[PDB]
Design a protein around this nucleic acid. Sequence first.
RNA 1: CCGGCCGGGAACUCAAAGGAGACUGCCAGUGAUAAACUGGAGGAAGGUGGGGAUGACGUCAAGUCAUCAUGGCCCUUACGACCAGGGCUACACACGUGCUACAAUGGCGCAUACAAAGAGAAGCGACCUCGCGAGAGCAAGCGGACCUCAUAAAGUGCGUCGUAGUCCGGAUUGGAGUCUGCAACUCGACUCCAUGAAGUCGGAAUCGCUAGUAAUCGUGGAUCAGAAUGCCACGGUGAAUAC
RNA 2: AAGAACCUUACCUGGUCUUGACAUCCACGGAAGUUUUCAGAGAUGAGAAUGUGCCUUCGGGAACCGUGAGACAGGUGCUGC
Lengths: 151, 127, 98, 101, 114, 79, 206
Amino acid sequence: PRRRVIGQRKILPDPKFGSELLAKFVNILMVDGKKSTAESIVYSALETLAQRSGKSELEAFEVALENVRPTVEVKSRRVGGSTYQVPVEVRPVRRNALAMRWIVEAARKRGDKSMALRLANELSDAAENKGTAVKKREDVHRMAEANKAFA
Amino acid sequence: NQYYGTGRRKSSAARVFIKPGNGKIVINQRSLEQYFGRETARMVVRQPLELVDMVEKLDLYITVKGGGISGQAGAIRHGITRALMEYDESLRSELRKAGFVTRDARQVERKKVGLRKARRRPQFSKR
Amino acid sequence: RIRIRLKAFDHRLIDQATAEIVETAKRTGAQVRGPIPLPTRKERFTVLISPHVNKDARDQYEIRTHLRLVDIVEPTEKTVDALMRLDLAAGVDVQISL
Amino acid sequence: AKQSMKAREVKRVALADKYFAKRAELKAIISDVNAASDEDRWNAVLKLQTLPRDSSPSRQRNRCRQTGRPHGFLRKFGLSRIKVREAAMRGEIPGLKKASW
Amino acid sequence: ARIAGINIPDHKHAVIALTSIYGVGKTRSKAILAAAGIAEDVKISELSEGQIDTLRDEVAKFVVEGDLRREISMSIKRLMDLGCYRGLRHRRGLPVRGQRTKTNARTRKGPRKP
Amino acid sequence: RSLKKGPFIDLHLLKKVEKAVESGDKKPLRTWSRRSTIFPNMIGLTIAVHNGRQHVPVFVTDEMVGHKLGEFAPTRTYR
Amino acid sequence: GQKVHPNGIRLGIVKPWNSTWFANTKEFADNLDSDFKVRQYLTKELAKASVSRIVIERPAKSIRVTIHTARPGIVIGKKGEDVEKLRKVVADIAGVPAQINIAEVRKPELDAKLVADSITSQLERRVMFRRAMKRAVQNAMRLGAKGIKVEVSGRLGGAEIARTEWYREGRVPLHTLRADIDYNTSEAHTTYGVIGVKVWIFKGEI
RNA sequence: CCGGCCGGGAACUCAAAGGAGACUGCCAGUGAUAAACUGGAGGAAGGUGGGGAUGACGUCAAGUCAUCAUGGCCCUUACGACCAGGGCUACACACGUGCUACAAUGGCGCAUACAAAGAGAAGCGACCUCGCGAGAGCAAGCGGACCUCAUAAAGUGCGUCGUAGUCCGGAUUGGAGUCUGCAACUCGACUCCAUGAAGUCGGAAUCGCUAGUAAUCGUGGAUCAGAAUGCCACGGUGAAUAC
RNA sequence: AAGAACCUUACCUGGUCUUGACAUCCACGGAAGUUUUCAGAGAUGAGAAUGUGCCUUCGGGAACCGUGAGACAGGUGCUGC
Ligand SMILES: [Mg+2]
């Protein structure tokens, strides 16, 4: 805000095996307050990917995440006349939140049968670093690294 | 021997009778597996119960009303926490440090005239 | 026995009327259940403070109806007679039923 | 405030109180499932128009008692919101105050 | 599966395929099903001809594609030649149930061309 | 779309109706009762229905029985 | 017009309701109509008596009316002939026996209604608006009070455009709820039009 | 007859009244030893605890002479009044605010659980019968912490749809049916038969929201003889970001 | 506008009236009230059977109903500049 220097809210750990990042992920997926079905699809696709990759659930999610985790971000700060872009780092909190949002978007789109299926497919292609969230990250790195003369 | 917990959350209110013995849940004459044991928010009533063993420490005869599923769930959680009085500050010094004793009212705000849900306006438009 | 239900608008009046009437009833008609509070009912009204456009401009008024059961348990002779002809403390509506 | 319409409503009300609630038999009784479904009920619903458009409880707009305002009327206080609020803020309605909670 | 109308469903459940007939809906189709002893979950690639015959002779009871088309045609022509409000609306191209025409009712009126 | 229990008419209207029935075809009968139905005996009348300002003479028809008079008495004129 | 009614906002905290009685929803409307009728008729009759207000109750289906005024002599007439005429002509319309009782206030200039009525009498007596305002404020504050504020709207001076003017003296917190404030507004009809006068007197602080 | 159904208690929630407490209360630091800011103990709540009502002097010569009263004007056998019907629902067409949606977190059908606050006597309206359903009839209780609205729905178990302008979606339209009401053509609501459109996320531009809020679901009330996707009110799951 | 089938309705046509639908007066006549027929879109007009006291000033009274002028009623008609 302008004056308030407040922090962020305090979410609860998920009922399923302890976690907070994927709890916030399910809270993002939750629309119209449909937490039950959001969590259902979350767990379904989670265990699907876990069994497809042979690993454990939260670690497979971390694998699919680190690949989509970006490096920098472009923002506009006009200085005396012409308006321009500027590439700059991003906090880890918003970094991982934006990675999860890209995951959710690539999952929502490209619908084969069901949302569990879409989310597991995106998880897989991100774990092997060939999905659409990773391509979003690549596009972000394209936007950056080019106009880096502004600083 | 048999202690009482009140419990309430989001316009809901409960009644819990805690007793040393088995560990079954009589939740409105149902089991926790039935009442909301297939739906989300399942271990909500169990969240205040893992810091101290519960499987074979004490059972609870529970009833609830008011609010929705999660509302009555928070009600039962507050009821557990109030019933935790024969297990007094010796344990509250940490239970509170991690919450579970804060009412966390955040009561729903009445709908204000001119609005749609007490904060939602009727889609303003300059022209 | 005698279900005695009184009702008013103002708590500071119904309270004193109930106190004095329960006194005059149990001082000779003892074995009462007391002034059971009978929770309040609120009749609310929303009106348009303006006579014209500015429909959005409105106001909210209300009226509170408080009641007090007494529930006398015995149809005493010091009660059936010394309760009637004693409907003072205007602004209150009373109904006794045997 | 259209004293003519006021007398119109007064007529409607009085003539209705006279005819209906007392002569419902024609339209509310003879029009029943029974042998009377023959020419009996036909003649009943025909004599129906023995009364004019008036005499009915449907033409009762329930206008205001002070100003005849049909809109903004409340069946409780018998008056429109305008005079309702007037008398309220003046303190004439027993037990009425500002509702805030 | 040449039932009245056109009725060329392949691998479609009973009522969902039968409603295709202009003259039958889900309800009348379920009635036909319970009459001819037909289920409402098995498809055309699995139904037998000894039961397709019952389909035919049971749907023959209510109006059909062509019969219903011509019946509606003669009814609306009756309205038009009657020249009541209904026929006047039918001829002017406006709805007949009396909804909004000032703004709505564009479906019956015509595309929002100009 | 209502009043299942038979039709509804006006005394004056049915009186003129049966008068014209027993007298034969007659000039248009002015009827302001758009809220009335038609009977199997009025086929052949040339009654004039009210629209709000003017009378529309209509030749009754056996198919024009269950309908009303406002049906064939246009009230709103457009262009 | 963006301010709330002081008396209305203070009813639920400090000031008492004008009509104090009970009634079920079935007869609340007719009860209020009878109250309005008796009120307007009594005002029509005794507007000369300078009545500040009237409280209306109904003990056991019988009407009772306290008249908070300042000229009980004029209200009653010698031996109470006026009291009797009023009781009769009011019970006729009320359908029940009426106990009408007067009650004097020996500080009439502290009543919003009485002061508005006096300013209106002077407005029809052709007295200057400034002088009337100042004289009423002085009357009140010199008789005793913790603040006053008067306002007038209309065509003061009989001019062509409508100009409203006010004048205050002392402390007068309206947003304060414990402030027992006397408030009322009168009307005055002259050859020029309508004139609305209003007053607020900070009588008490609790 | 396991229905607190009942004898039996005032244990408990709840209950209306009368009070306590939550006021920077105190401590550590910072701050010009001041104001004050930040963190912390206990505590449910910490600094205006949450929300609400409360609208400064006055501006826009803002809107209402149609709620009412009124300065003047004007009709005053009339610009007055009554009655049948019609109109306000009219339609080349442009715009604003809401519901439905435009689907697979799901349409879909069967079995399952959980709201608070209210209203209700020329009204709410048990049981029972029929009625696909409007709802019809007989006929208890209730002008009320009893009798009725009133079964709460999302949530969950089984599975069709397993991706198609499709079983998403319901408008247009005819015959036939119930109901409010003197009457349903203009011009009502409701339930069934037949129907399924555009619409596949929406262009520039633009609105609301920092919490139980939005999002979404359901329920009640006023208007009413009858007539909401609106208004008001209550509750349901329950976020996000804030550099 | 917290709710247009009539009404609501302030608009349109047609049929009506006039100190008038609405409050009051004098004088005159009838007591009201109740049932009923005819034409009309009805308003209204043409009617037919029933109906009498609360006080005796008791040449009548208190309401109710109708007739004549007048004062007037009546307007959702104008300017919210
Ligand atoms: Mg000037």
